[PDB]
Design a protein around this nucleic acid. Structure first.
Ligand SMILES: [Mg+2]
Ligand SMILES: [Mg+2]
Ligand SMILES: [Mg+2]
Ligand SMILES: [Mg+2]
Ligand SMILES: [Mg+2]
Ligand SMILES: [Mg+2]
Ligand SMILES: [Mg+2]
Ligand SMILES: [Mg+2]
Ligand SMILES: [Mg+2]
Ligand SMILES: [Mg+2]
Ligand SMILES: [Mg+2]
Ligand SMILES: [Mg+2]
Ligand SMILES: [Mg+2]
Ligand SMILES: [Mg+2]
Ligand SMILES: [Mg+2]
Ligand SMILES: [Mg+2]
Ligand SMILES: [Mg+2]
Ligand SMILES: [Mg+2]
Ligand SMILES: [Mg+2]
Ligand SMILES: [Mg+2]
Ligand SMILES: [Mg+2]
Ligand SMILES: [Mg+2]
Ligand SMILES: [Mg+2]
Ligand SMILES: [Mg+2]
Ligand SMILES: [Mg+2]
Ligand SMILES: [Mg+2]
Ligand SMILES: [Mg+2]
Ligand SMILES: [Mg+2]
Ligand SMILES: [Mg+2]
Ligand SMILES: [Mg+2]
Ligand SMILES: [Mg+2]
Ligand SMILES: [Mg+2]
Ligand SMILES: [Mg+2]
Ligand SMILES: [Mg+2]
Ligand SMILES: [Mg+2]
Ligand SMILES: [Mg+2]
Ligand SMILES: [Mg+2]
Ligand SMILES: [Mg+2]
Ligand SMILES: [Mg+2]
Ligand SMILES: [Mg+2]
Ligand SMILES: [Mg+2]
Ligand SMILES: [Mg+2]
Ligand SMILES: [Mg+2]
Ligand SMILES: [Mg+2]
Ligand SMILES: [Mg+2]
Ligand SMILES: [Mg+2]
Ligand SMILES: [Mg+2]
Ligand SMILES: [Mg+2]
Ligand SMILES: [Mg+2]
Lengths: 197, 137, 110, 117, 63
RNA sequence: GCUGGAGAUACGCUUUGACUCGGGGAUGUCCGAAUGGGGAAACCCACCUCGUAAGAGGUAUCCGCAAGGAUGGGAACUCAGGGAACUGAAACAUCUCAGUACCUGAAGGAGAAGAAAGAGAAUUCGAUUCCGUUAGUAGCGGCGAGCGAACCCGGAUCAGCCCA
RNA sequence: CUCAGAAGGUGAGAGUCCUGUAGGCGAACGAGCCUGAGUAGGUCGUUGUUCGUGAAACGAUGACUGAAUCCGCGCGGACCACCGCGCAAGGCUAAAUACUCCCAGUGACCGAUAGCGCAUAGUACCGUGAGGGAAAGGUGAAAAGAACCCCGGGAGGGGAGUGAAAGAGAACCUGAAACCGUGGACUUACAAGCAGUCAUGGCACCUUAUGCGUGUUAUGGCGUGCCUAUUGAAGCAUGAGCCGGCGACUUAGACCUGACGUGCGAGCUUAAGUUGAAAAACGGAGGCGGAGCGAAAGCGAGUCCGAAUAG
């Protein structure tokens, strides 16, 4: 339901679902996204069983001390940890329909204020970043807003020097997180609305 | 949008029971009452006279058909219901079993459905609406 | 133990060269490079000075004295100069000493 | 992630130790004994907040029938006769203070003695 | 995992639709013949009361 | 520039390119599988040949005619011979822990296994291995505690070659 | 400026001061008629496989025995016939698999009682031995590491000087608490005490602070530590010298069963893996609704008992 930019034009239309971003739909997609990448790298040696320490220190009875039996246990300084973190997974399969629904609500929430559609190419001389900065300045991308960019030609991204600017993705790299993370979204107008099926 | 203004749907998330941790709730004993309730847990379907101890009458095998009530079959509006292996039915328990149509409701219309077997009266209600059914031969 | 210099043990100047401090006290001051210490990253120059009272050991000096001596710095005196100020510099070309590269900034050699 | 006790225990502990102030001996300088002292101090606090009102009732009563007997009456008698006289409904606090202003308490005694003959 | 206890299999339980637990009728099941005709005839119910939860967890899928 | 950590003074080396880095050679006492002989590891005693001596080289057993090969070592992994109990069964013999622990042997960068006298009930498949799944199904069981497949199907990888 | 905003360093935080895979180049010469007999088969003792002697096939064997060969031989879970699948008694065989002494990168891992036992040591120390086995970090930006002077044999200190700072001085960041002391306010030598609490007077001070308190104190009232365990705890029942730090309801699995929430909804979802990773997509093998009754055949809105009537 939104228009275009420089390389050409379009007057583009497509249906946008009502965003549940602040709702659990977008919030769920973001949480699944961050959790999916987790490294599970918590290995404490904590279990009494790998602390490297001995046998049976002294007398079960009649020494006048406290009772203990080995030196490898959570009550002992130096021993293991009860219930220490172990390496593990964190990843799970969020339902697919919620994936696509989230990403669509993402795009949508940006169309409600400030999304932009790069029309079948920008003019950037060679690959020089300075001309990207000129191009974006002439498309109203100040120096201010953090912005995300999606495209496919190598060169236009090869002005991908984030300077409080230019977080960069190709096609299919899109994700609810990376767009929701930025203010304006400079979506690549082409496959930006090549309708599925 | 506001990544700080993402809000989980109220409900959904609920906090874990942190057990030990104070006479502000669930103190010394951790919801366990002073008992022969102690770490290394042991049992779930057992007392000692057992009483799931009644006697048994035993067959080993079984085999059964995929079910196709004709009621959905008849309101279909597209008649001559010979299923390609994929479509509509058997999604649960599809390719491992055989089909058998049965005399759940009716709507009356012509239709030639070719299930692997069928109830005697689905022939009654299918042939009565001028409708063949090809049991495999 | 903390490890030494991380500058790939590479000094950016010879013991011959003139140089200027560009930071701290002595900024703008200039001198010859009386001692280069790459692996520890330290630079002797006639700029910084310090009054070292060596403790009297009677080693020809029963009662000790206070010497005036220059105390070394590191990669904070700026490299060579030419338009009268410090400069970034670039590898150059061959000369009549054609086995050598020289240096330059927005200019000539050193 | 680890999450050791760090700052938290020392701060609760200092809160108790500062409640301690002029507590004799370890009661004010060792944490555990300060905490435990404050348990029993809770007991004393709440109950005394109740009791003080029994206390001042008792004191006003003492003074009131002291004054009542200065004139040949007594608390039972003076309080009842005042009650019989178009219910005065002065508090027992207030009747004391009029036992600091004798000329009035006197007339209250004559008035109670009236509504009683 | 969570295996079902095979002792409950052909043993007098079965799962009625609507989630109720089956059982068989036991007393004088075998080795008794001064029992009355109806008594020998009395087996075959399986409606069974406040045990059901445990009988259910005896059989996950109704084997 | 260097002159090891070392934070130390003195002697110095380096445009003939030191130092540091990448690569090869050469030197490498004595002990250790140790192996000339012995031995309480690093030591004590010899014999044969070459040599002016000083010094150099040889001297264990087991396969081989011979070239040549083997002794020993190696975190965990692999195969193999041998092989527990605590423990569960609310006691305990069968059963379980469990072919786990441990010992021993053999080897490599992996090993094992492998090319249907098969799987299996479609006259289907087409070496082996590993993953998913079937499935806690089929079964095994003081039919107790409990133990528990495979075929089909989806993937990783995919070769078959030589003998009597 | 930017194909280079990764990162470290530099007197506090540097895109442009230094070191820098963004990109680019790079070596002498160095890595990469036959077809298996003491066999198959068998009996005795045993065992693997879901295989506990069970109707127990089959493989594997320790003792004894012991055949056929293409109208031939093994197998299909006692066994027989038919039907069907194979060719033993000879060998070799990459890759998909496992592991981490070693190396690199990374981390909703640790950061000096944590993290390996070790900020390095299998040391010190303990044991004849096998074996066991510690704690321990921090000047400053830069040694400019305190010449000189004073008391002292020294140790230690006070000055001077360096330094932003010595409120960093080598017993060298912060520097809590228990514990020991000095000085000051208010106080105590007729007094019975879980040590507090309420009340009031006295004295003292006024930086969240002059009705306001804050600190202390005299006298009055009241008042049986904590926890655990228990019918019942001040208990002459357990535990504890004190403080600091360590210290206990977790993790897992396509497991199960509930509640809440979300996406689809008569339908709902993938796993192993493949391709891309500054991010995800693909992948219907399979799993769950969908029909029940029965011991099972099986029949099916019906199904079981039973000779049709009862449940
Ligand atoms: Mg004791
Ligand atoms: Mg540790
Ligand atoms: Mg609660
Ligand atoms: Mg208890
Ligand atoms: Mg336990
Ligand atoms: Mg009252
Ligand atoms: Mg599994
Ligand atoms: Mg049933
Ligand atoms: Mg040095
Ligand atoms: Mg020898
Ligand atoms: Mg030899
Ligand atoms: Mg020997
Ligand atoms: Mg037992
Ligand atoms: Mg071994
Ligand atoms: Mg070996
Ligand atoms: Mg396959
Ligand atoms: Mg600037
Ligand atoms: Mg045999
Ligand atoms: Mg046998
Ligand atoms: Mg048995
Ligand atoms: Mg047979
Ligand atoms: Mg056999
Ligand atoms: Mg058969
Ligand atoms: Mg053959
Ligand atoms: Mg941390
Ligand atoms: Mg440590
Ligand atoms: Mg410490
Ligand atoms: Mg000793
Ligand atoms: Mg010793
Ligand atoms: Mg230092
Ligand atoms: Mg002196
Ligand atoms: Mg001194
Ligand atoms: Mg000082
Ligand atoms: Mg200090
Ligand atoms: Mg100290
Ligand atoms: Mg000192
Ligand atoms: Mg000293
Ligand atoms: Mg500091
Ligand atoms: Mg300090
Ligand atoms: Mg004094
Ligand atoms: Mg004092
Ligand atoms: Mg007195
Ligand atoms: Mg008092
Ligand atoms: Mg008792
Ligand atoms: Mg009592
Ligand atoms: Mg006592
Ligand atoms: Mg006690
Ligand atoms: Mg004691
Ligand atoms: Mg599941």
């Amino acid at each position: 339901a939104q228009i275009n930019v420089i390389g050409q034009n379009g007057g583009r239309t497509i249906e946008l679902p009502l965003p549940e971003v602040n709702s659990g739909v977008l919030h769920e997609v973001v949480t699944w996204q961050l959790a999916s990448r987790r490294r599970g790298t918590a290995s404490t040696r904590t279990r009494a069983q790998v602390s490297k320490t001995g046998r049976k220190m002294y007398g079960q009875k009649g020494t006048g001390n406290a009772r203990h039996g080995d030196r490898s246990v959570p009550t002992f300084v130096g021993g293991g940890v009860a219930f220490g973190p172990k390496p593990r997974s964190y990843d799970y399969t969020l339902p697919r329909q919620v994936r696509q629904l989230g990403l669509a609500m993402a795009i949508a929430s940006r169309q409600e204020g400030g999304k932009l559609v790069a029309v079948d190419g920008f003019d950037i001389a060679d690959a020089k970043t300075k001309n990207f900065i000129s191009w974006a300045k002439q498309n109203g991308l100040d120096g201010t807003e953090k912005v995300l960019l999606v495209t496919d030609d190598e060169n236009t991204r090869r002005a991908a020097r984030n300077v409080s600017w230019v977080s960069v993705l190709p096609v299919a790299g899109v994700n609810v997180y990376d767009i929701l993370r930025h203010d304006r979204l400079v979506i690549d107008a082409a496959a930006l609305e090549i309708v599925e099926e | 949008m506001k990544l700080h203004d993402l809000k989980p749907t109220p409900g959904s998330r609920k906090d874990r029971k942190r057990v030990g941790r104070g006479p502000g709730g669930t103190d010394k004993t951790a919801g366990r009452g002073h008992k022969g309730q102690k770490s290394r847990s042991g049992a779930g379907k057992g007392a000692f006279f057992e009483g799931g101890r009644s006697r048994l009458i035993a067959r080993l095998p079984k085999r059964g058909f995929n079910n196709v009530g004709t009621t959905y079959e008849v309101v279909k509006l597209s008649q001559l219901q010979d299923l390609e292996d994929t479509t509509f039915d058997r999604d649960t328990l599809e390719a491992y079993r055989l089909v058998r149509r049965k005399n759940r409701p009716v709507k009356l219309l012509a239709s030639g459905e070719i299930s692997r077997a069928v109830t005697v009266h689905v022939d009654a209600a299918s042939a009565a609406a001028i409708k063949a059914v090809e049991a495999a031969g | 133990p903390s490890a030494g210099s991380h500058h790939n043990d590479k000094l950016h100047f010879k013991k011959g060269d003139t140089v200027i401090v560009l930071s701290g006290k002595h900024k703008g001051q200039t001198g010859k490079v009386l001692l280069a210490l790459p692996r520890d990253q330290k630079v002797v120059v006639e700029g910084v000075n310090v009054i070292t009272k060596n403790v009297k050991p009677s080693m020809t000096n029963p009662q000790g004295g206070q010497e005036q001596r220059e105390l070394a710095l590191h990669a904070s005196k700026v490299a060579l100069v030419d338009p009268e100020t410090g400069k970034a510099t670039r590898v150059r070309k061959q000369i009549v000493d054609g086995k050598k590269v020289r240096v330059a900034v927005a200019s000539g050699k050193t | 992630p680890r999450a050791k006790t760090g700052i938290v225990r020392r701060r609760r502990h200092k809160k108790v130790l500062k409640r301690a102030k002029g507590f004799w001996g370890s009661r004010s300088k060792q944490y555990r004994n300060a905490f435990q002292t404050l348990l029993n101090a809770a007991t004393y606090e709440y109950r005394d907040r109740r009791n003080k009102k029994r206390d001042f009732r008792r004191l006003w009563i003492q003074r009131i029938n002291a004054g009542a007997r200065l004139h040949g009456m007594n608390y039972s008698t003076f309080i009842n006769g005042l009650k019989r006289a178009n219910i005065d409904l002065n508090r027992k606090v207030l009747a004391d203070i009029a036992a600091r202003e004798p000329e009035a308490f006197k007339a209250l005694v004559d008035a109670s003695r009236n509504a009683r003959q | 995992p969570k295996m079902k206890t095979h002792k409950m299999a052909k043993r007098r339980i079965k799962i009625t639709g609507t989630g109720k637990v089956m059982a068989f009728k036991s007393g004088k099941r075998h080795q008794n013949t001064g029992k009355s005709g109806d008594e020998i005839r009395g087996k075959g119910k399986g409606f069974v009361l406040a045990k059901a939860e445990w009988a259910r967890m005896k059989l996950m899928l109704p084997r």
